[PDB]
Symmetry: D2
Subunit: 106 residues, 4 copies
């Protein structure tokens, strides 16, 4: 139960990254800074792995959470440069998951 807050934060960050992925693929004219798409995919995959590792009580919980913190920091810093509302929600959820994973792993 000591990682449940980080589990719920990473599930919300998964949902925000997948929503930003889909709503960036729907729009066409901006090109949405395609590193945002690649980073949203890699952030959703590392957050899915972090949820899987925290829910299974793995002995590599802190290292996966530190890597997820780094990827979430980069995904938030790249998605915050956009004007769309889904990208701002993705950046806010990524920074929340990043500060949660940095406060978790020590």
């Amino acid at each position: 139960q000591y990682s449940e807050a980080c589990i719920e934060a990473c599930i919300d960050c998964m949902k925000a990254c997948n929503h930003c992925f889909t709503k960036c693929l729907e729009e066409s004219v901006q090109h949405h800074l395609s590193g945002c798409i690649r980073l949203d995919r890699e952030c959703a995959d590392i957050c899915a792995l972090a949820v899987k590792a925290m829910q299974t009580d793995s002995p590599f919980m802190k290292e996966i959470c530190a890597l997820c913190a780094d990827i979430c920091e980069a995904c938030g810093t790249e998605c915050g440069k956009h004007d769309h509302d889904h990208c701002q929600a993705c950046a806010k959820a990524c920074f929340t998951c990043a500060e949660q994973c940095r406060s978790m792993a020590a």
Copy 2:
């Protein structure tokens, strides 16, 4: 929003399958009917893929949800034969996710 109930049910089924995986790996003397472990892993992986496909609005949402319904039916039918409380919770969450995916895909 028309698949959000199935998304939350599959996230609860992911958590229940991973918890049954970990608590079946912790105990030693029963051997916990190792098909339960393999089916809990495959059910958690197909439910993670189903959550990823429903959150990304994929064109193959119904087929992944029907496969997730079949795997959740089998995982519930195999985990319901056990006396442990985590296995009964896993079976109840798997049957809830199974009836949700069967009511969803049509």
Copy 3:
């Protein structure tokens, strides 16, 4: 060993779909028919799950392989409409994996 040809074909299809994903994200002016990007991601994920299910001898091998056949048929039919060489390689690997999964599952 009776699914090893399908395992190697799905690994080659994973590599081709990820390469088409990356080389579609690199180019900017075409927009690369963003359904190609979404289908390449979903095809790489279902082929990773199919490789995981065939390598673990799961009881749901044929259903995952039939779903992988459907997704590979759709990804090949959508990537074959493009002029880029990586998209043509992705379409050829997807149709090879599709005919291998359709000849496998029966």
Copy 4:
């Protein structure tokens, strides 16, 4: 092409970890030191993510490869304590993938 050797080594390590998972779940009387099963699952999942990140040319290639090196070192050190041939093959593939990921990331 500068990570293709690590990609093939991680694919062989995925196959060895999944084979050790399945052949540890088949046998019953040893109990196969269930941390071996959990570590084989987590090693196969981090190696699948490392293959996905190296095949997609992600900007977080070195960090995922260093985490995969740590998990492969631990999985090899835990699987080398067993007498079964699949566990020894899993340990040899894990140490090969570990030295490849440690020679790769710098």
